Amino acid sequence: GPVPSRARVYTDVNTHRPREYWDYESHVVEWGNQDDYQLVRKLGRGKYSEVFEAINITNNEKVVVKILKPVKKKKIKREIKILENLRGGPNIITLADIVKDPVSRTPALVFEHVNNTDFKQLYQTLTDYDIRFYMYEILKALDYCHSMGIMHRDVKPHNVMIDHEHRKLRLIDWGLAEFYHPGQEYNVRVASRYFKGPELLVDYQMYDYSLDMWSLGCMLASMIFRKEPFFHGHDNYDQLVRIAKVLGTEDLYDYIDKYNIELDPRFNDILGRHSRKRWERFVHSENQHLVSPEALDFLDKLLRYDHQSRLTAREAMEHPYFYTVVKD
Ligand SMILES: COc1cc(/C=C/C=O)ccc1O
């Protein structure tokens, strides 16, 4: 069988929390007044929700209303409990209210409004300094949720809302987030394809917070190299091949051998043999202003096959890449 794995940090946070903290199945939802919120315009529709701009008519302030699609009460209660546990934490989207939508017959989550700069304008204009600044802000959110026994499991650009005018960042959509329990096996069908960690792609279920750090690395690579997404697989198998063409196949085999994992035999005729590449290979005249020795070393230390080898969020915040960022 597969060799077991443990997070190297925050391993026992939920063990020593009261049961009510992580036992979300027993959570009792406290419902607000549905008539407090007037929907204004539909912002989007995801796999699991529809999102609206709304007005809270008790303060005439803008809010965001997320009307959940019908899914298991436990996935719904999981997201609600996680949002309540993390509320007030650094750069965590703030759940303001929960109401029963009378049309959908499902919960509608009410969030603080973030006047986000749309993401294409963002990624084509962010400066070297901007990238460092916002990466640090994401790390605050991730260290917070990891320290609170929670992994996000869907870190990607669309879940990082940035109001560039006020230099304000919020990590959103905690619908895939889970509580970390040592030894627990998790669903590997999480995260967007391009941001899936190698653990997911080789079906290793005993993963942890470090999954989010791979996803973060993929975001960083896309920003400093101006290639979005960075690892652009056509499916989940090709996704691992794309990663292997960069990190090399010998270290992939070291990884799966360490945990006594076997690759899907369908890799036998698509994987090939690949050397590990130096990150300088991806530098060119159109991205070089975003690249520094510090950026490349930081990236290098996020994108490891071995989830146990990646920087933690706290270690990442110590990295020289952030020395130039003004600390508040
Ligand atoms: C999709 O999930 C979310 C979206 C937003 C805001 C979106 C604004 O366009 C806030 C919290 C969420 O969980």
Side-chain angles (χ1 to χ4, degrees):
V3 171
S5 171
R6 291 297 179 278
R8 301 176 66 186
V9 293
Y10 304 132
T11 315
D12 305 317
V13 283
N14 286 318
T15 297
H16 300 283
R17 288 261 176 191
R19 173 177 162 104
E20 71 229 21
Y21 183 82
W22 51 257
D23 185 29
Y24 61 83
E25 287 154 85
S26 76
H27 181 63
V28 174
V29 176
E30 281 174 345
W31 303 100
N33 285 16
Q34 186 271 339
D35 46 283
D36 286 354
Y37 308 101
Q38 175 115 74
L39 303 177
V40 169
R41 60 179 190 115
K42 184 159 66 177
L43 299 177
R45 174 187 290 161
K47 183 170 162 24
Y48 294 115
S49 65
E50 283 192 344
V51 177
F52 298 83
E53 176 174 283
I55 299 178
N56 181 340
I57 67 172
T58 68
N59 59 23
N60 283 347
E61 294 199 291
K62 298 189 178 181
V63 294
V64 165
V65 174
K66 182 179 177 178
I67 305 183
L68 305 178
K69 292 185 190 165
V71 66
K72 43 215 283 199
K73 205 24 184 171
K74 135 196 151 161
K75 176 157 134 67
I76 293 176
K77 277 197 190 175
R78 186 179 68 190
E79 182 176 357
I80 290 173
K81 187 62 186 186
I82 282 170
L83 286 166
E84 291 190 3
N85 287 349
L86 302 178
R87 183 159 49 212
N91 297 335
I92 310 298
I93 196 69
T94 300
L95 178 68
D97 209 348
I98 309 158
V99 301
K100 293 166 157 298
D101 187 85
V103 178
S104 73
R105 305 171 65 80
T106 65
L109 305 184
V110 184
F111 298 97
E112 63 174 313
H113 178 257
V114 177
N115 195 350
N116 63 306
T117 320
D118 196 45
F119 299 97
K120 307 314 177 162
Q121 176 166 311
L122 273 180
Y123 275 36
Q124 239 149 24
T125 67
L126 287 187
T127 63
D128 176 33
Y129 188 83
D130 286 336
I131 293 172
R132 305 192 196 211
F133 180 88
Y134 285 127
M135 282 286 298
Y136 196 78
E137 293 303 304
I138 299 171
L139 285 167
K140 289 177 185 175
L142 291 178
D143 185 53
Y144 188 71
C145 70
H146 298 166
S147 77
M148 295 285 282
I150 292 160
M151 49 190 165
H152 186 278
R153 305 201 301 177
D154 200 23
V155 169
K156 61 179 180 175
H158 264 302
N159 285 339
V160 180
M161 297 273 286
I162 294 170
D163 183 346
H164 197 29
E165 175 172 350
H166 306 270
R167 301 211 100 188
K168 169 180 165 189
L169 184 149
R170 296 291 184 269
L171 182 55
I172 62 161
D173 205 349
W174 298 80
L176 289 192
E178 258 288 13
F179 294 86
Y180 175 69
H181 297 281
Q184 190 159 133
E185 295 190 322
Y186 294 93
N187 187 4
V188 296
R189 294 175 61 79
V190 295
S192 156
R193 184 190 310 142
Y194 309 132
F195 303 90
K196 291 171 181 287
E199 54 269 56
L200 306 185
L201 303 171
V202 303
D203 295 309
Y204 185 78
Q205 294 184 259
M206 203 172 296
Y207 59 82
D208 57 72
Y209 317 109
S210 54
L211 170 62
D212 294 332
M213 302 304 297
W214 177 273
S215 303
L216 187 67
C218 295
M219 294 189 49
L220 180 65
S222 71
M223 298 177 307
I224 70 176
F225 293 135
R226 296 234 292 206
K227 180 181 188 305
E228 212 283 326
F230 187 69
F231 297 115
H232 204 168
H234 302 122
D235 58 43
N236 291 338
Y237 306 110
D238 185 58
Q239 184 67 25
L240 183 61
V241 180
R242 299 305 180 114
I243 292 166
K245 290 186 172 179
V246 179
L247 277 60
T249 47
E250 294 196 276
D251 290 321
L252 172 57
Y253 274 99
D254 288 339
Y255 176 50
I256 65 180
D257 287 351
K258 173 173 172 187
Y259 296 95
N260 288 7
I261 296 161
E262 281 200 292
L263 288 181
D264 189 329
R266 81 177 75 203
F267 281 109
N268 288 165
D269 312 325
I270 59 173
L271 184 54
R273 295 196 295 172
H274 304 283
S275 64
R276 193 151 199 156
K277 307 310 187 295
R278 306 185 197 268
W279 291 108
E280 286 83 2
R281 158 190 281 244
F282 305 104
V283 180
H284 51 64
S285 60
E286 284 67 56
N287 66 23
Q288 69 189 32
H289 63 290
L290 303 176
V291 178
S292 59
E294 291 79 11
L296 296 185
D297 181 64
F298 178 49
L299 180 64
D300 188 53
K301 288 166 163 52
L302 295 174
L303 296 181
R304 318 303 305 182
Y305 287 119
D306 193 346
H307 52 278
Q308 289 179 5
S309 298
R310 302 174 198 147
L311 294 179
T312 67
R314 200 63 194 261
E315 291 181 306
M317 300 177 65
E318 301 287 292
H319 195 279
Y321 182 61
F322 300 107
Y323 287 174
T324 196
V325 175
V326 167
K327 303 313 186 311
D328 299 16

PDB file of all heavy atoms in Angstrom, residues 43 49 51 64 66 79 93 111 116 159 161 172-174, ligand 1:
ATOM      1  N   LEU A  43     -23.293  38.190 -11.540  1.00  0.00           N
ATOM      2  CA  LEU A  43     -21.877  38.332 -11.843  1.00  0.00           C
ATOM      3  C   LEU A  43     -21.337  37.101 -12.554  1.00  0.00           C
ATOM      4  O   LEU A  43     -20.476  37.203 -13.431  1.00  0.00           O
ATOM      5  CB  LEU A  43     -21.094  38.596 -10.558  1.00  0.00           C
ATOM      6  CG  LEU A  43     -21.500  39.872  -9.823  1.00  0.00           C
ATOM      7  CD1 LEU A  43     -20.735  40.023  -8.517  1.00  0.00           C
ATOM      8  CD2 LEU A  43     -21.303  41.088 -10.717  1.00  0.00           C
ATOM      9  N   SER A  49     -22.514  27.293  -7.789  1.00  0.00           N
ATOM     10  CA  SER A  49     -23.196  28.491  -7.298  1.00  0.00           C
ATOM     11  C   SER A  49     -23.477  29.487  -8.414  1.00  0.00           C
ATOM     12  O   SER A  49     -22.910  29.390  -9.503  1.00  0.00           O
ATOM     13  CB  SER A  49     -22.367  29.176  -6.200  1.00  0.00           C
ATOM     14  OG  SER A  49     -21.135  29.664  -6.725  1.00  0.00           O
ATOM     15  N   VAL A  51     -23.502  33.778  -8.561  1.00  0.00           N
ATOM     16  CA  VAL A  51     -23.014  34.884  -7.771  1.00  0.00           C
ATOM     17  C   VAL A  51     -23.610  36.187  -8.278  1.00  0.00           C
ATOM     18  O   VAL A  51     -23.651  36.438  -9.483  1.00  0.00           O
ATOM     19  CB  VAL A  51     -21.472  34.949  -7.819  1.00  0.00           C
ATOM     20  CG1 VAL A  51     -20.970  36.148  -7.065  1.00  0.00           C
ATOM     21  CG2 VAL A  51     -20.897  33.674  -7.237  1.00  0.00           C
ATOM     22  N   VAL A  64     -22.095  40.843  -1.896  1.00  0.00           N
ATOM     23  CA  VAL A  64     -22.109  39.794  -2.897  1.00  0.00           C
ATOM     24  C   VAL A  64     -22.949  38.664  -2.344  1.00  0.00           C
ATOM     25  O   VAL A  64     -22.802  38.279  -1.181  1.00  0.00           O
ATOM     26  CB  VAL A  64     -20.681  39.316  -3.247  1.00  0.00           C
ATOM     27  CG1 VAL A  64     -20.722  38.007  -4.001  1.00  0.00           C
ATOM     28  CG2 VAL A  64     -19.978  40.374  -4.076  1.00  0.00           C
ATOM     29  N   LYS A  66     -24.031  34.759  -2.896  1.00  0.00           N
ATOM     30  CA  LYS A  66     -23.683  33.513  -3.535  1.00  0.00           C
ATOM     31  C   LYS A  66     -24.777  32.480  -3.285  1.00  0.00           C
ATOM     32  O   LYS A  66     -24.903  31.939  -2.185  1.00  0.00           O
ATOM     33  CB  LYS A  66     -22.336  33.035  -2.982  1.00  0.00           C
ATOM     34  CG  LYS A  66     -21.811  31.749  -3.586  1.00  0.00           C
ATOM     35  CD  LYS A  66     -20.463  31.422  -2.948  1.00  0.00           C
ATOM     36  CE  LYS A  66     -19.878  30.116  -3.422  1.00  0.00           C
ATOM     37  NZ  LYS A  66     -18.529  29.884  -2.775  1.00  0.00           N
ATOM     38  N   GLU A  79     -18.628  24.391   3.885  1.00  0.00           N
ATOM     39  CA  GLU A  79     -18.231  25.732   3.469  1.00  0.00           C
ATOM     40  C   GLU A  79     -18.653  26.769   4.516  1.00  0.00           C
ATOM     41  O   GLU A  79     -17.860  27.618   4.912  1.00  0.00           O
ATOM     42  CB  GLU A  79     -18.807  26.075   2.097  1.00  0.00           C
ATOM     43  CG  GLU A  79     -18.369  27.460   1.620  1.00  0.00           C
ATOM     44  CD  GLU A  79     -18.843  27.807   0.226  1.00  0.00           C
ATOM     45  OE1 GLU A  79     -19.489  26.965  -0.438  1.00  0.00           O
ATOM     46  OE2 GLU A  79     -18.571  28.942  -0.218  1.00  0.00           O
ATOM     47  N   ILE A  93     -12.149  36.315   2.679  1.00  0.00           N
ATOM     48  CA  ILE A  93     -13.444  36.927   2.374  1.00  0.00           C
ATOM     49  C   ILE A  93     -14.373  36.793   3.584  1.00  0.00           C
ATOM     50  O   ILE A  93     -14.407  35.750   4.248  1.00  0.00           O
ATOM     51  CB  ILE A  93     -14.086  36.296   1.118  1.00  0.00           C
ATOM     52  CG1 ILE A  93     -15.209  37.186   0.588  1.00  0.00           C
ATOM     53  CG2 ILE A  93     -14.586  34.880   1.377  1.00  0.00           C
ATOM     54  CD1 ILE A  93     -14.695  38.478  -0.007  1.00  0.00           C
ATOM     55  N   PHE A 111     -21.631  37.964   1.331  1.00  0.00           N
ATOM     56  CA  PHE A 111     -20.241  38.346   1.587  1.00  0.00           C
ATOM     57  C   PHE A 111     -20.047  39.849   1.499  1.00  0.00           C
ATOM     58  O   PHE A 111     -20.791  40.549   0.812  1.00  0.00           O
ATOM     59  CB  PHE A 111     -19.298  37.694   0.575  1.00  0.00           C
ATOM     60  CG  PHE A 111     -19.284  36.204   0.615  1.00  0.00           C
ATOM     61  CD1 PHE A 111     -20.053  35.465  -0.277  1.00  0.00           C
ATOM     62  CD2 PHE A 111     -18.484  35.532   1.526  1.00  0.00           C
ATOM     63  CE1 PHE A 111     -20.029  34.082  -0.255  1.00  0.00           C
ATOM     64  CE2 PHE A 111     -18.448  34.154   1.551  1.00  0.00           C
ATOM     65  CZ  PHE A 111     -19.223  33.420   0.659  1.00  0.00           C
ATOM     66  N   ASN A 116     -13.425  44.365  -7.282  1.00  0.00           N
ATOM     67  CA  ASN A 116     -12.268  43.755  -7.901  1.00  0.00           C
ATOM     68  C   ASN A 116     -11.938  44.326  -9.269  1.00  0.00           C
ATOM     69  O   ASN A 116     -12.820  44.607 -10.083  1.00  0.00           O
ATOM     70  CB  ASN A 116     -12.478  42.255  -8.031  1.00  0.00           C
ATOM     71  CG  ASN A 116     -13.648  41.918  -8.931  1.00  0.00           C
ATOM     72  OD1 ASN A 116     -14.764  42.397  -8.723  1.00  0.00           O
ATOM     73  ND2 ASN A 116     -13.396  41.104  -9.948  1.00  0.00           N
ATOM     74  N   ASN A 159      -9.921  32.906  -7.923  1.00  0.00           N
ATOM     75  CA  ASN A 159     -10.344  32.909  -6.525  1.00  0.00           C
ATOM     76  C   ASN A 159      -9.550  33.882  -5.668  1.00  0.00           C
ATOM     77  O   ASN A 159      -9.615  33.846  -4.436  1.00  0.00           O
ATOM     78  CB  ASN A 159     -10.253  31.495  -5.953  1.00  0.00           C
ATOM     79  CG  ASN A 159     -11.388  30.615  -6.443  1.00  0.00           C
ATOM     80  OD1 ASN A 159     -12.426  31.119  -6.883  1.00  0.00           O
ATOM     81  ND2 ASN A 159     -11.214  29.309  -6.360  1.00  0.00           N
ATOM     82  N   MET A 161      -9.473  37.700  -5.364  1.00  0.00           N
ATOM     83  CA  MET A 161     -10.083  38.966  -5.743  1.00  0.00           C
ATOM     84  C   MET A 161      -9.238  40.144  -5.293  1.00  0.00           C
ATOM     85  O   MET A 161      -8.927  40.277  -4.113  1.00  0.00           O
ATOM     86  CB  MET A 161     -11.486  39.073  -5.154  1.00  0.00           C
ATOM     87  CG  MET A 161     -12.399  38.005  -5.690  1.00  0.00           C
ATOM     88  SD  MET A 161     -13.155  38.570  -7.223  1.00  0.00           S
ATOM     89  CE  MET A 161     -14.318  39.738  -6.508  1.00  0.00           C
ATOM     90  N   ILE A 172     -11.255  33.924  -2.008  1.00  0.00           N
ATOM     91  CA  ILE A 172     -12.674  33.554  -2.047  1.00  0.00           C
ATOM     92  C   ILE A 172     -12.911  32.088  -2.421  1.00  0.00           C
ATOM     93  O   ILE A 172     -11.948  31.311  -2.613  1.00  0.00           O
ATOM     94  CB  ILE A 172     -13.445  34.436  -3.049  1.00  0.00           C
ATOM     95  CG1 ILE A 172     -12.902  34.249  -4.474  1.00  0.00           C
ATOM     96  CG2 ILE A 172     -13.364  35.903  -2.652  1.00  0.00           C
ATOM     97  CD1 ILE A 172     -13.899  34.717  -5.551  1.00  0.00           C
ATOM     98  N   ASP A 173     -14.196  31.740  -2.522  1.00  0.00           N
ATOM     99  CA  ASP A 173     -14.713  30.403  -2.871  1.00  0.00           C
ATOM    100  C   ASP A 173     -14.072  29.265  -2.071  1.00  0.00           C
ATOM    101  O   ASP A 173     -13.231  28.486  -2.559  1.00  0.00           O
ATOM    102  CB  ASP A 173     -14.591  30.126  -4.372  1.00  0.00           C
ATOM    103  CG  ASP A 173     -15.607  29.096  -4.842  1.00  0.00           C
ATOM    104  OD1 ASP A 173     -16.244  28.453  -3.970  1.00  0.00           O
ATOM    105  OD2 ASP A 173     -15.777  28.933  -6.069  1.00  0.00           O
ATOM    106  N   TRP A 174     -14.512  29.178  -0.824  1.00  0.00           N
ATOM    107  CA  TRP A 174     -14.093  28.124   0.089  1.00  0.00           C
ATOM    108  C   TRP A 174     -14.966  26.871  -0.051  1.00  0.00           C
ATOM    109  O   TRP A 174     -15.003  26.035   0.847  1.00  0.00           O
ATOM    110  CB  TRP A 174     -14.118  28.667   1.526  1.00  0.00           C
ATOM    111  CG  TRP A 174     -13.142  29.802   1.663  1.00  0.00           C
ATOM    112  CD1 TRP A 174     -13.335  31.109   1.281  1.00  0.00           C
ATOM    113  CD2 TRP A 174     -11.791  29.719   2.138  1.00  0.00           C
ATOM    114  NE1 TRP A 174     -12.189  31.841   1.518  1.00  0.00           N
ATOM    115  CE2 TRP A 174     -11.239  31.017   2.054  1.00  0.00           C
ATOM    116  CE3 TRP A 174     -11.007  28.682   2.662  1.00  0.00           C
ATOM    117  CZ2 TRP A 174      -9.920  31.292   2.451  1.00  0.00           C
ATOM    118  CZ3 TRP A 174      -9.683  28.965   3.046  1.00  0.00           C
ATOM    119  CH2 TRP A 174      -9.168  30.258   2.945  1.00  0.00           C
TER     120      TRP A 174
HETATM  121  C1  LIG B   1     -17.696  31.909  -6.141  1.00  0.00           C
HETATM  122  O1  LIG B   1     -17.466  32.016  -4.743  1.00  0.00           O
HETATM  123  C2  LIG B   1     -17.372  33.304  -4.184  1.00  0.00           C
HETATM  124  C3  LIG B   1     -17.413  34.488  -4.935  1.00  0.00           C
HETATM  125  C4  LIG B   1     -17.309  35.713  -4.276  1.00  0.00           C
HETATM  126  C5  LIG B   1     -17.345  37.029  -5.026  1.00  0.00           C
HETATM  127  C6  LIG B   1     -17.364  37.083  -6.368  1.00  0.00           C
HETATM  128  C7  LIG B   1     -17.402  38.444  -7.021  1.00  0.00           C
HETATM  129  O2  LIG B   1     -17.485  38.537  -8.233  1.00  0.00           O
HETATM  130  C8  LIG B   1     -17.175  35.783  -2.897  1.00  0.00           C
HETATM  131  C9  LIG B   1     -17.124  34.617  -2.160  1.00  0.00           C
HETATM  132  C10 LIG B   1     -17.228  33.395  -2.804  1.00  0.00           C
HETATM  133  O3  LIG B   1     -17.186  32.198  -2.094  1.00  0.00           O
END
